[PDB]
Design a protein around this ligand. Structure first.
Ligand code: HEC
Ligand code: HEC
Ligand code: HEC
Ligand code: HEC
Ligand SMILES: [Ca+2]
Ligand SMILES: [Ca+2]
Lengths: 354, 125, 376, 376, 125, 355
């Protein structure tokens, strides 16, 4: 039944009937063959995703769905730091509150309202059988019950072993099953002794039972606008993506420009990087951090463009304490970090590494 | 008391040099200066930087990664001094060197050394 | 009988076994209380020094404050702050000299003022507690200057600024009584009352002479500001008591810490802080031992306790160690603090039985000054 | 048999009794010679530190130099000056940081240059002698920096000016060969030659890797600049010798300080300055003792001596104490210095027979480093 | 060796605390840091101010005024520490009080303490 | 012989025939009744002395002869410190070399030359006897032998126990015959722990056999010109008394403004003080020194005038090392020092101590 529920969500996840013109499904943008992300090329590369209308582009990179089941529900913890939720800006409380939003989003799946979704579900004999067997008879005749029920099944699907296998190289090495190379182990060592582990580790101290390389916090690391992505999103050159402050109910101006710490699981295979796909190479993502630490002129230059990285989209709320560590990553250290981050690739996605 | 003998860890007293988490500590144990096993004494500043070591815990027979971090911006505590070197490497392998003052990234650019803490950050491997 | 190291380990293990997380951070010291005790380490005249903030009840270092060359500590009686006057040079022990006062928060230990003292005016001397002093309202710090002549500095803590120097007669130590009045002990053997304001010559009145030229009063008298009680031992253990609680100096009758027999056999006060006074119980405590007469800075092994209204001996404790300085917590059932320069160790005693309860060791290179606050 | 204190006692007695006058004055140190030896006291990471200037022959402290947080001492080979790079802060251990180089006259001990280093560049680590180094003309001081990246600082002593930072690869230590050239030790296992001008990017050229990743070279090699001989032991006792006298690195036969049978009985170098090098005798000295593999920073009680050319053992001394640091005087009939951190005592030995001749104690709080000047 | 016992002067070793001229010294004996019985070590500055004691010389049975003077401008030597108080008086009689750092009149206004010399200035009265 | 020579000297000392108009002898300006100093009032009070012509004044105060025989002859020692000699600027090498100069100096005794001195001695039958029994016959017929001989004898006479009796209270105290009052004792203790001992003590360390409270050195302590005195001397407003430098032979301009540390013995009864007699009161001479230490507005002020101490006559080569002690003398200690310095009064002049 928890099994049935998830099995029902597996049908919906790949069903283009959930979009307005039936040209797309969740799996369109979160492709199981590419670690549940978008392999498609739009006007701003793979930085942003094209919606159901074949024209509209969003303003943010589509993250993996892998391991998002482990993310706790949205909440401010006792040190006053907001934690968890879903979307890069946390504006959904959890996987259930999230699942309806792509459906109704005009630049994504673009259904006109809950009733329309219910009409699409009611038109399929397997959904009538599957839904009423779990949520009771007439569920699909009520827009709210139906839509709510479709969210429930999608979330349950996402919380199964297929989305979170824990069978990467890093996992087998922590189970004693094998050994890092020299280069890989150097990388881990660099990861847990340099500032990364202040953000991309579940716990501050102690061992995590199910590590996802994210403490679920929100941080502004001072990324620039993605010029082209922003041009394609059509949101206007006067727009500012305020991150977590944009969540309704958040009024603290200190939250402007802050975005949830992504999990580095499968990171090698989910580029381009960051909330606005600004960087295509994993090497570049890592080297961006050097700009707060390094004195060499080359650290002021984005190696993918040849130019200065660019000013922060939101110049306030930088996490300078964590970012100003006072130690630069040489290339030998960047190489190792890449190598180790590659070991967070799930088994099934190791073929992609090349 | 025999300094040249194998180090033998214990898990019953954090203020002793042979407490299991101090296997590669170099300086002073913060617990003896107003701090705690994994907190800094008031007035001082906590580094972000660390050196690391794999430390065998005799209680549960496992090995843990201790990311030693320095509390800085004060003169050295002088209390419960300790020098251990379990898996310690030369300065040219800095993530495992402990002669270095790992005060980097501390508030106010505090760089003097007061004492060290011993928080677990991983399982060894 | 389990130590603090042992408890912390046992808890660490349960946090580990339970998987209890916590964020490594900057602690706060517990809130100032009667059983807080500060120890200062002049470090045998070293250019940089340390103060140790101790919970007397647990026997635990709860903090430290760094200082320069022979700093003078004070501790506000209400617990609201602590402060010192200190000295530093542009190159360790050499080059340009800056004298300053720092005011710290008592639980963060963070500086809340740094007030520069112009013309390097502090008296550089083996630390005497009453060579720098707070006024009873906690608003003003007063410090002694020896050179080029006896004078008192006035520092406004509330406005965080130096006000003025005060010309004084040939007097020493500073015992505040009011926001605008303190007393000093002068070379002729009187006390002098100094009434001052922001500018003008201060009104300076001498008391009558209260001791002869060849009786020696120690550099470490106890003064309870909240009782207005000045308690001043001599080389022999004769104890002068002056009552200032009226705002003028009333000379109480003298008492003898030591019997004639003990005096005859060579018993004498000795050490550094040789005396303590508990306000609520009206008792005097005195470090004493058998010594030759010019060995008055040596450590002692005994404390005599006496009633301060009668002079009657209450008790003679055997301290078990070499003790240079003493003081008491100012609560009920008070602790008696016994500091050993030689052992670099604070032994903590029950003041009623004189039984050693616990000890704190590794307190620098030469700890010498114990300070408490009278919070009652 | 008559001590120095004793002799002094008779001289004073004889002056007094003959009516000899004499002006109390500032002494000068005797002139720099082969038997002069400098001992540095990092003081277990203390914020101020001391250097001790000693006559090796008499076994006498002849002067002293105060210093900041983890200073690096250098000594000029020709005896014309001594110097260190040091670090201070506006309030002891807190506030604004000043890094600086000070150069001193070696008989007056007065500063002759104070040269500030901009943006607080010094590497703060347990003192390694070759993290700060003089060029063989003595006109330039080169210091290492770790943060934010390996770099090298060029200070001009002659003009008394910091000039600039050299960007370098991931390399450690500074071994100068010429007025404009030095070597480092890089992570991969090579040495890097760094040739620099008064401006421009320096020319950097690697050698081949001369050791494996699993073979650990210590933080305290001996380098004779006048020989151009680098002498670098590993944790197990094997000894690399690099010849840089040509101005390029020619790697001599590796040698074994211990025999395979000793190594299987757990003989291993251990301590701080585990190795010394005598230029004239072409001779290597090494602190060894029986220990587990990861007690490498513990004190040793033996010194082996070997020929550099052939690798044959010449002597094995029982030092009689816990020794942490060794060095030698670079004259003929050299002394062998054995510094005991724990004992705070320099032990001065005959470097032929390894007999103890005399000692100097109370050497600060935790002394660690020995520096001589090769004046031959 | 019994610290509370009558001090007993000798006239055969100036680096011992029972040397006769050291009768009211407080700090460090300057001979032990490259100075001499009556000269400051290199690098330090000689105070003009002093404090006096009348010390008995067991070599000729006479007593001598020793006007102690500090060597200043350096951190304390730490070698041959000594504290004696024959005839020593509290602060309000400063000429005889030895708690005080008598560094006044030193060149460069040096006021830090390093060691103390013990020259004679005259006979006792 | 050593007896007779001095007896002869004792005659010449009080003999006014050695002056041009025979109004004046050594004992006029060096009066035994006032510790060998000038009690007479001239145009500048007792600051400088009037010559034999009734009119001319010197530019310098007349010092005590008492204890002058303990001063070594002029020399440079190993430290490069010139030491000793006679006169405030040391221009005579010793007592004999000095003795002649007053006789021939026109502002003082004012004889025209050696021959006229010989012509006066020759006129006395008691001089022909004494001189010829000591220096052989015909001495008084040769001007250069006779003048030299006169000096010899005046120097001998100055080296007697009459001039150096070591019978001050301070001496008697030191010999265990009496004790200091507490104030004298506190004054003594101050003297030996403050900067005074750095110049007003025979030696750098140890104990002198015969202490005269002076190290015979040369120092400029920054004294102003005494105007009334300088006017009386008529040397001109642009004159500068270069102290030691003015000795023929000295060329080191670092010796400009440096004068000989006077013995403090009998200081209490020989005011006014310093080389130009600029301070009337012993107390003022002690207080002058506070100018180098104190901060109080009163320390720049000469209490005798109510006006600033003054500009130094020679504002360079000041002994700042010794003078800047960092410690101001409070009134108690000035009282104490006055007291102690009175104990340096020779017994025969203790009666003088009242006035
Ligand atoms: C006549 C026989 C004598 C003798 C033996 C001395 N005097 Fe005088 N004297 C006078 C003044 C003003 C001074 C200081 C002058 C200067 O510094 O240039 C002196 C000095 C001396 C000294 C030197 C003393 C010293 O301690 O440095 C000696 C030894 C000495 N005198 C002996 C003033 C006068 C006179 C003024 C009218 C007359 C006449 C004399 N002196 C005569 C003699
Ligand atoms: C055409 C694009 C598109 C479609 C269709 C789409 N998504 Fe997304 N998805 C995104 C983008 C872009 C983001 C990041 C958006 C943001 O944060 O504003 C996102 C975010 C999410 C997140 C938050 C993950 C995180 O780490 O914050 C979840 C969960 C998710 N999608 C699940 C789904 C499900 C379930 C469906 C359909 C049943 C769906 N998505 C349909 C593009 C799409
Ligand atoms: C104090 C916070 C913080 C620190 C320190 C930090 N990160 Fe991040 N990191 C983030 C946040 C937040 C994001 C998402 C930011 C955004 O896109 O707006 C991010 C994104 C990334 C990404 C891109 C992942 C993706 O799917 O797009 C990589 C790779 C990464 N970090 C690696 C590192 C490494 C390697 C270090 C240090 C060695 C490091 N980070 C230090 C907060 C941090
Ligand atoms: C470093 C030199 C120096 C120091 C220090 C010094 N003096 Fe003098 N003193 C002199 C010299 C030189 C004279 C003569 C000055 C002159 O006439 O120009 C002098 C003159 C005097 C006189 C006048 C005596 C006379 O015969 O005219 C008295 C009185 C005196 N000093 C007392 C003191 C006292 C009291 C102290 C300190 C407490 C002191 N001095 C410190 C050098 C010194
Ligand atoms: Ca991506
Ligand atoms: Ca006079």
């Amino acid at each position: 039944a928890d099994d049935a529920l998830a099995a029902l969500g597996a049908q919906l996840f790949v069903d283009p009937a959930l979009s307005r013109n039936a040209t797309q499904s969740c799996a369109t943008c979160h492709d199981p063959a590419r670690a549940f992300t978008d392999p498609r090329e739009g006007k701003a590369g793979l930085a942003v995703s094209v919606g159901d209308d074949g024209q509209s582009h969003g303003d943010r990179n589509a993250p993996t769905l892998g391991y998002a089941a482990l993310v706790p529900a949205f909440h401010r913890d006792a040190n006053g730091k907001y934690k968890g939720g879903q979307f890069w800006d946390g504006r959904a409380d959890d996987l259930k509150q999230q699942a309806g939003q792509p459906m109704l989003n005009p630049v994504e799946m673009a259904m006109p309202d809950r009733a329309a979704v219910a009409a699409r579900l009611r038109d399929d004999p397997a959904y009538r059988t599957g839904f009423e067997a779990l949520f009771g008879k007439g569920v699909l005749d009520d827009p709210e019950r139906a839509f709510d029920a479709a969210a429930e099944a999608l979330a349950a699907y996402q919380a199964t072993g297929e989305f979170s296998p824990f069978d990467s190289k890093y996992d087998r090495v922590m189970r004693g099953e094998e050994k890092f190379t020299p280069l890989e182990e150097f990388g881990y060592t660099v990861f847990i002794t340099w500032n990364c582990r202040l953000c991309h580790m579940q716990r501050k101290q102690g061992v995590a039972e199910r590590e996802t390389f994210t403490n679920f916090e929100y941080h502004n690391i001072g990324l620039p606008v993605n010029e082209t992505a922003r041009e394609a999103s059509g949101l206007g050159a006067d727009h500012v993506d305020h991150g977590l402050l944009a969540r309704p109910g958040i009024e603290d101006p200190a939250q402007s420009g802050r975005f949830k710490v992504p999990s580095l699981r499968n990171v090698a295979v989910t580029g381009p990087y960051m909330h606005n796909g600004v960087f295509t190479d994993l090497r570049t993502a890592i080297l961006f951090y050097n700009k707060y630490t390094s004195r060499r002129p080359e650290a002021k230059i984005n190696p993918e463009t040849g130019a200065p990285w660019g000013e922060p989209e939101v110049a306030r709320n930088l996490s300078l304490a964590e970012l100003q560590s006072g130690l630069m990553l040489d290339d030998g250290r960047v190489d190792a970090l890449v190598a180790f981050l590659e070991t967070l690739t799930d088994r099934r996605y190791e073929p992609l590494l090349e | 008391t025999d300094p040249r003998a194998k180090w033998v860890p214990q898990d019953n007293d954090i203020q002793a040099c042979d407490y299991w988490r101090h296997c590669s500590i170099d300086g002073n144990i913060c617990d003896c200066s107003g701090g705690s096993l994994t907190n800094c004494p008031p007035g001082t500043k906590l580094a972000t930087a660390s050196w690391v070591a794999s430390c065998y815990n005799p209680t549960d027979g496992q090995s843990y990664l201790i990311a030693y971090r320095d509390c800085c911006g004060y003169n050295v505590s002088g209390r419960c001094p300790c020098l251990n070197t379990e898996g310690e490497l030369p300065v040219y392998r800095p993530e495992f060197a402990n002669d270095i003052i790992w005060c980097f990234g501390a508030e106010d650019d505090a760089m003097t050394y007061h004492c060290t803490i011993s928080p677990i950050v991983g399982k060894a491997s | 009988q389990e130590t603090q190291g042992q408890a912390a380990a046992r808890a660490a293990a349960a946090d580990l076994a339970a998987g209890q997380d916590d964020e490594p951070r900057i602690l706060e010291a517990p809130a100032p209380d009667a059983r807080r005790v500060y120890v200062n380490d002049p470090a045998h005249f070293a250019a940089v020094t340390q103060q140790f903030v101790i919970d007397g009840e647990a026997g635990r270092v709860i903090g430290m404050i760094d200082g320069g060359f022979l700093p003078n500590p004070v501790v506000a009686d209400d617990g609201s702050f602590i402060a010192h006057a200190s000295t530093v040079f542009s190159r360790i022990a050499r080059g340009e000299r800056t004298d300053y006062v720092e005011v710290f928060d008592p639980v963060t230990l963070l500086p809340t003022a740094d007030i520069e003292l112009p013309d390097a005016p502090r008296f550089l001397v083996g630390t005497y507690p009453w060579m720098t002093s707070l006024t009873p309202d906690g608003k003003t710090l007063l410090f002694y200057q020896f050179s080029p002549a006896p004078a008192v500095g006035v520092v406004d803590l509330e406005g965080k600024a130096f006000k003025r120097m005060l010309d004084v007669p040939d007097c020493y130590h500073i015992f505040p009584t009011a926001p605008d009045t303190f007393f000093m002990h002068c070379r002729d053997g009187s006390l002098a009352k100094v009434a001052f304001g922001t500018e003008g010559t201060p009104e300076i009145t001498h008391t009558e002479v209260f001791h002869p030229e060849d009786e020696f009063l120690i550099n470490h008298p106890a003064y309870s500001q909240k009782a207005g009680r000045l308690v001043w031992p001599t080389y022999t253990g004769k104890i002068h008591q002056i009552d200032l609680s009226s705002g003028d100096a009333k000379f109480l009758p003298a008492v003898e810490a030591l019997t004639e027999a003990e005096r005859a056999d060579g018993w004498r006060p000795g050490g550094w802080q040789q005396v303590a006074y508990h306000r609520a119980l009206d008792r005097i405590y005195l470090l004493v031992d058998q010594r030759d007469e010019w060995r008055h800075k040596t450590a002692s092994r005994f404390v005599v306790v006496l009633d301060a209204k009668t002079g009657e001996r209450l008790a003679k404790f055997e301290m078990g160690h070499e003790i240079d300085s003493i003081n008491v917590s100012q609560d009920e059932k008070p602790l008696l603090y016994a500091l050993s320069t030689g052992d670099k160790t604070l032994y903590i005693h029950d003041a009623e039985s004189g039984e050693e309860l616990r000890s704190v060791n590794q307190l620098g290179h030469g700890p010498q000054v114990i300070t408490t606050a009278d919070m009652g």
